[PDB]
Design a protein around this nucleic acid. Structure first.
Lengths: 537, 178
DNA sequence: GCCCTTTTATAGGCCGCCATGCCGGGCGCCCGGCCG
DNA sequence: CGGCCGGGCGCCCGGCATGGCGGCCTATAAAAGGGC
């Protein structure tokens, strides 16, 4: 057997990803050294595109792309639903003839391979030897139009979706969209007009994601072909279904930069629709709010959007940040983890804006809600993001004045000290916290019932202990920032906790003292807690 | 009293109140398998919380594999949502947990033969066929499989307190035999 | 019978394999002799 | 006393094909809902 037979099998039987990456690199270098035998490699790598394994198909597509990248460029002149010469002409035809195969794996591989081939060699497609230059250019236009037409027909007929996770995934739609994005780089603007007319601005959206984001600099400010897409996206954002909302939000986020640059006028309507859609409390099981908040964070990150938002609060404060961003607070305790993480990340992006707007909504309300998040969270990632947001908020609030931090959180400090220094029970005999200590996002008093009740049997003791140490870190930091004369209630609370009849509360008090000592400017400040600890040991 | 059982499986039934075309579910959802010769339902799956759903043509479904009541209810709601997305007018109705399984490990071996001899009216033991003593309890209606290693699994419960009561009832007996 | 989930776990039967031969035919070894 | 002696018998050869241990492999056990 030759080296190639053993080298191709690594793409399927490779023990690790680096081994398969090295296999494709070696195969590409092989084609480079022996340019006369592209078909030998292609005939052995192409059959993997219809393999059942996902990773094998992806690796085969990457191998085909890297093999083809080393061959010379070509220039011979001088409604049935989908459910579960040009040198590469026969390869592309074999991909297109099973692009409508019933099995979804074959379609996935066909789309990936067509993307990879056209990505490097789309310019020379469709031409035939012996024809004139201009007529061959017309033939290339015909070929690219045919490929775009067939791919768009595939997009409008495929309904295969995966519901394993909250965010539904359409593999064939995504691959076909990337294929359109590969195709549309080389065509002339007349074919771009034709494709924009074919994918009419109505609500496809995943198709729009790559019908724009290609030839981007020329589509910008191009009249209707850029004015209609914003209408289509805005209509999608206000639609009822969560799926179309999520897809539209994910389609606008990578294009947010040039859609912002397209007009200053469109920003008002866009941010209005985004905030209006986020204001309505979505359905409990929807992951779309995460995409909506990612879109909001990305849009607010650009300077001109900040200028537009500052301009918007002209006649009143209704559209200002201070009144609006509390609309994100209800989603802090949403059932789906992605929404909670998105809320925290968007709030961190807003906090790191500066520009004298952050002082508006930064107050004791958000601090207390984030402390409740720390206490009642079970997911590690959301807990980490919550503590990061807490640290950033406390640091920003102490940037203005330590007195502002000290008296803003003074209203809330004692109940949060009760929560942080709360005991932990045994499995069948919990020691529940008082629900009156927890605030609602839009209410004075309170999904998180198990953590509040202290049910160790239903939520593991590790989770409770981790919540306690996280609360200790947060409260130690906020003790450290605020001035010493204001710490009377804090210090007497921990001192009384150090003498409690409970075991868990003493541990929490020691943890709070340790974190306060760690975060201080110098260790000597916390010396008032010396002798109680020596009495403990 | 001592240690507490850990729940291992909860089975819930929920009625979607609408007829379903199973093959249309299978052809569209990646996470669904349908084999009408083997079984009459589509076996859907989701990865948070890890559960499986036997969704039938009559609109009923059986959701299994959950480790808690809230997880089971949330998974049933997610499956109802998934059926709604595929076009059917499924509505979450008639939820009721119908089995809970638990497992515990007391830290000493058990003399199964003496236990079977003394409690013959409430137990069965055929070591040639199955290496665990079977115990059937009348008051909480729980069935316990007792093993020489000191591990007991309880089944048939419809509430957590039932397995807790069954373990409390059985623990003195296991203490008596080593 | 048929299927889904879950923690527990080990000992009977079923399909195989596997050494059993046992008559002549030969070789090689050590174990008994003796021969000039 | 040294050296060649016969001499026995354990070892291996080979066939077909039968009976007795095998390991290994479901099946064993429990709850329950649904439909066929």
């Amino acid at each position: 057997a030759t080296r190639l037979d053993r080298l191709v099998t690594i793409l399927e039987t490779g023990s690790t990803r680096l081994i398969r990456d090295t296999a494709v690199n070696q195969l590409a270098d092989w084609q480079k050294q022996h340019p006369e035998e592209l078909f030998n490699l292609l005939s052995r790598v192409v059959p993997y595109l219809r393999h059942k394994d996902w990773e094998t198909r992806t690796t085969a597509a990457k191998a085909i792309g890297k093999i083809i990248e080393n061959a010379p460029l070509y220039d011979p002149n001088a409604g049935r639903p989908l459910l579960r010469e040009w040198p590469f002409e026969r390869l592309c035809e074999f991909l297109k003839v099973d692009l409508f195969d019933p099995q979804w794996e074959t379609r996935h591989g066909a789309a990936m391979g067509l993307r990879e081939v056209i990505r490097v060699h789309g310019a020379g497609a469709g031409r035939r030897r012996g024809k004139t230059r201009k007529e061959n250019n017309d033939l290339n236009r015909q070929w690219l139009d045919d490929l775009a037409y067939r791919l768009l027909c595939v997009l409008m007929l495929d309904k295969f979706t995966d519901y394993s996770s909250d965010t539904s995934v359409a593999p064939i739609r995504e691959t076909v969209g990337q294929t359109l994005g590969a195709v549309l780089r080389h065509i002339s603007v007349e074919s771009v007009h034709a494709i924009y007319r074919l994918l009419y601005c109505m609500v496809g959206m995943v198709g729009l994601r790559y019908v724009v984001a290609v030839r981007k600099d020329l589509l910008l400010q191009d009249g209707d072909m850029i004015d209609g897409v914003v209408r289509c996206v805005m209509q999608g954002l206000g639609d009822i279904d969560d799926d179309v909302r999520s897809v539209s939000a994910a389609t606008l986020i990578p294009m947010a930069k040039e859609f912002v640059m397209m007009r200053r006028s469109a920003l008002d309507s866009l941010i209005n629709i985004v905030w209006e859609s986020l204001s309505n409390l979505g359905d409990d099981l929807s992951a779309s709010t995460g995409k909506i908040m990612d879109l909001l964070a990305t849009l607010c990150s650009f300077p001109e959007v900040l200028e537009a938002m500052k301009v918007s609060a002209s006649q009143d404060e209704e559209r200002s940040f201070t009144l609006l961003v509390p609309r994100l607070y209800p989603f802090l305790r949403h059932t789906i983890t992605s929404v909670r993480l998105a809320v925290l990340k968007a709030l961190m992006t807003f906090a790191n804006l500066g520009g004298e707007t952050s002082q508006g909504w930064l107050n004791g309300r958000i601090l207390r809600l984030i402390f409740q998040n720390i206490i009642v969270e079970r997911d590690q990632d959301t807990l980490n993001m919550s503590l990061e947001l807490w640290t950033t908020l406390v640091r920003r609030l102490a940037a203005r004045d330590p007195a502002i931090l000290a008296d803003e959180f003074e209203a809330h400090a004692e109940p949060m000290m009760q929560l942080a220094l709360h005991p932990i029970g045994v499995p069948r005999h919990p020691i529940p916290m008082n629900p009156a200590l927890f605030q609602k996002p839009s209410g004075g008093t309170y999904v998180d019932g198990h953590m509040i009740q202290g049910e160790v049997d239903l939520v593991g003791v590790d989770v409770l202990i981790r919540s306690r140490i996280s609360a200790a870190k947060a409260m130690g930091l906020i003790m450290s920032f605020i001035p010493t004369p204001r710490l009377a209630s804090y210090d007497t609370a921990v001192l009384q906790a150090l003498s409690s009849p409970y075991a868990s509360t003493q541990l929490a008090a020691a943890m709070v003292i340790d974190e306060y000592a760690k975060n201080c400017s110098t260790p000597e400040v916390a010396s008032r807690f010396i002798e109680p600890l020596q009495k403990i040991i | 009293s001592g240690i507490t059982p850990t729940l291992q499986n909860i089975v819930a039934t929920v009625n979607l109140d609408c007829r379903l075309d199973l093959k249309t579910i299978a052809l569209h959802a990646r996470n669904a398998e349908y084999n009408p010769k083997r079984f009459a339902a589509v076996i859907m799956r989701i990865r948070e919380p890890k559960t499986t759903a036997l969704i039938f043509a009559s609109g009923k479904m059986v959701v299994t594999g959950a480790k808690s009541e809230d997880d089971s209810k949330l998974a049933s709601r997610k499956y109802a949502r998934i059926i709604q997305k595929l076009g059917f007018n499924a509505k979450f109705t008639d939820f009721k947990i119908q089995n809970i399984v638990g497992s515990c490990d007391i830290k000493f071996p058990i003399r199964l033969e003496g236990l079977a001899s003394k409690h013959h009216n409430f137990s069965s033991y055929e070591p040639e066929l199955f290496p665990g003593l079977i115990y059937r309890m009348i008051k909480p209606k729980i069935v316990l499989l007792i093993f020489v290693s000191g591990k007991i699994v309880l089944t048939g419960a419809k509430v957590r307190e039932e397995i807790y009561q069954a373990f409390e009832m059985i623990y003195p007996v296991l203490q008596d035999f080593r």
